[PDB]
Each structure stands twice: as structure tokens, then as C-alpha cells.
Structure 1
Amino acid sequence: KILTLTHNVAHYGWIPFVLYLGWAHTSNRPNFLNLLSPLPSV
């Protein structure tokens, strides 16, 4: 089901590409829990 496999990528995979974009350019590069956490606990 490659056709719908590409379909699921558009929804779930768009934001993490942006997230991966920022995390790549972050000088800190924390872990996924810290990225998704709205807390400033760093």
C-alpha cells in the first residue's frame, strides 16, 4: 500500500520535518522529550 503510505507521510510527517529542521539548527539540540515539552526546564 505504497500509495496510501505516501498519504500518511503528509499528515504525520510534515511537522517533524520542521521540527527536525529547527533541531538541526539548534545550538543546544536537546532530546525529543525536551523539544515536545512546553516547559522551560531545559
Structure 2
Amino acid sequence: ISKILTLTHNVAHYGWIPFVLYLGWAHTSNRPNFLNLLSPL
């Protein structure tokens, strides 16, 4: 029963940085698709 207190911490271990990209993907003119994980342009 105590594992959910530790399984909650293992949700943020892999599912927090992808949440931040989804926020500002909508707060633009909503163009780009995969250029955001790319260095030149």
C-alpha cells in the first residue's frame, strides 16, 4: 500500500519535462512539430 507514495515520485522521474513542452506548444501561433528538439533552426 506504501508503494504509491514511492510510485508517485517515479512519475515525475520520467514525466515532468515532457509536460513543460506541451504547455508552450499551445501558447504560440501553434506551428512547429519537431524543430523544437533541434539545434540549428
Measured against the shorter chain, the TM-score band is 0.3 to 0.5
Specify which structure has the bigger relative contact order, considering alpha-carbon pairs within 8 angstroms and separated by 6 or more residues: 1
Deviation at 1:9, TM superposition (A): 2.6
- TM-score by length of structure 2 reads 0.48
Counterpart of 2:8 in structure 1 is 6
Q: 2-side partners of 1:14 and 1:4: how far apart?
A: 16
Stretches of structure 1 lacking an aligned partner (at least 5 in a row): none
Q: Deviations over 1:1-42 (max 9, x none)?
A: 977764443122111111000001121331134455553xxx
- Structure 1 length as normaliser, TM-score? 0.47
| Rg comparison, structure with higher value | 2
Q: How many residues align?
A: 39
After TM superposition, the runs of 4+ consecutive aligned structure 1 residues lying more than 6 A away are: 1-4
Which blocks of at least 5 consecutive residues in structure 2 are unaligned? Answer: none
